[PDB]
C-alpha cells in the first residue's frame, strides 16, 4: 500500500492511496484502500488521509472518516483523532497498520501503531522528513 | 501553510533483516518523491494533482506494494486497488481489482474525471479506462523477484 | 422493543401514473416480508439472521430491484451487490459485480463467516461462493419484462 | 435497491442491503449498497442503516455512518441525524434517496427526498406500517 495527502496554496486537501493487496490473499478480496472512507478521504472543511494496514478492519471502522468525524463532530484535534483510531479503536477490532493525514489548518500526523511505515513530509519550501521505524 | 505527506505500507518492517543500504534505497525514494510533491505544491500546482503525482511515484517504485512491485495473490497473479479524493469538491474516483492498468491511481482518477461514477471494477473498470485511451499492459509488468519470493515463502 | 425496517428503493414513484391494484402488490409484498421478519424478532431470531431474510426474499421478489427484477447494465446484463453487517460484533460481508448468484445477500453473509474478508469481487467473490456449495444461477433468471422496457426506454 | 435493520430483543442492530444498482450503468460500477458505510452499516453503540439513492453520492457522503458518527460524535437523535444526512447533506451534493435506521433504543426513521420510497416497518408483536408516497 502506498498514499499521498497534501493541502495546496489554495487551501484545497486531497488523497489518494493505491495497493497490490496482500501476498497469497484470495483473488476478488477488496480491502480499505479503494474504499472511500476506509483507505481514503479528504474534505476541505476537515482532513485528508491515506491509510495502510489490516484492510478489514480499516473498512469496519471507516477509520479515514472516522478521523474527519471526530474531528468535525467530536471537536477532536487531529492528533487526538490519530489517537483515538490508530492507538485506541483500530487496535481494539484486532487492527494494525497506521495513516496520514493532514487538516484543513495544515496540521500533519502520521500515525502508525506498527513496528514500522514508510512516510515522509515536508511543508512547501522547507526541508523534508523521511521515516521507517517509531521514535 | 502548503503540505504533502507520503507513506509506503505499515507493518512488521524489521530492523534485525535490513542492512543499511537496504534502508537509504526506501529513505531515498521517500524523499525523491516527497521533494517533487513539495516543489510542485510550491509551484502553486493542485493537491490533487500532487497527490496523484506522489502515488504514481510510489506505484512506479518497485520497492513499495502498488503498481511495479505489487505483491502476488493466491493464484500467483496481481490484482491492483487505488483511490483519490478531491476535497474540494468531495468527488472521489476508485479502482479495484484490475490486471492490466500500469497506474491505478491514474486509472482512479479517470474515474473521478471522466465518468459520472466514483468506483469501478475488475474488466468493466479496465474497459473504461481502454475507451478513454489509457494502456492495456501485461499483469507480468508488476512482478518482482523480491515479491514473487515472498510469496514462495508464505 | 425489538423492531424491524425494510425498504425496497427510493425514487420518482408516481401516483399519477399507478392504480390501486398495482400499488396493492407493493404493500402487500412489504407487509409480507415486515411481517416475516416481526415473527422472528418476537421468536428471538437475531437481528442479523432477521436483515439477512428480509433482503433474502426483497432480492426474490421481482417487484424490487434485487435479485430476482435486477435493473440490467447498458450491455443488458445484471451486476448485483450486497453488503450485511453485525453491529455486535462490527463484522460485515459484501460482495460486488456479482451475476451468477441468485442470493447475493447470502454470499455477503458468507463473505463474513467463512472468510476473514469484508469484500469480494466479481468472479472471485463467485468462485469463494462457489467452493462453499453456493449455487451458480445463469444471470437470465434475474430478468423482467418490465425493468428490459426501462432499458429500452432508458436508451 | 433493497434492505433490512432491525433491533433484536438481545439489543443487537444488524443491517443488509441488495442492489442491482441503476438501470443502463457501465459494467463494473459499484454505488454504495455494498460499500460499509456509504449504503450499509450497524453498531450496537449507535444505529443500523440501510441507504438507497444516487449510490455515487451515497458514498462521497459515507451517509450510513455519517448517521452514527452524527448521533454518536455530534450528540443528535436519529431524527435530527436523518434530517440533516437525506434532507441537506446528500440534496446539497445533488445526492436523492433515502434510508432507513434504527438505533440501540429502537427509534426509527425512514426518511426520504423523493417522491417515494417503499418502505415498512413494525415493532414485534405489533401491526406494521407500509408506505409508498411522501406523508
Ligand atoms: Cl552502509
Ligand atoms: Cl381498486
Ligand atoms: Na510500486
Ligand atoms: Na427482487
Redesign the pocket.
Known sequence: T?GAVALDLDGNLAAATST?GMTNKLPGRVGDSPLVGAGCYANNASVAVSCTGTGEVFIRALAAYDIAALMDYGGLSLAEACERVVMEKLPALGGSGGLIAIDHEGNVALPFNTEGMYRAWGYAGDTPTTGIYRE | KAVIAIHGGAGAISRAQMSLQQELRYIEALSAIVETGQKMLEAGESALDVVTEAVRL?????????????VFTRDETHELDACVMDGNTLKAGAVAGVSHLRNPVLAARLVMEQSPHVMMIGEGAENFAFARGMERVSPEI?STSLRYEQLLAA
Open positions: 502506498v497490490g | 510510489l506505484e512506479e517504485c518497485p520497492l513499495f506494494n502498488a503498481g511495479i512491485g505489487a508488476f
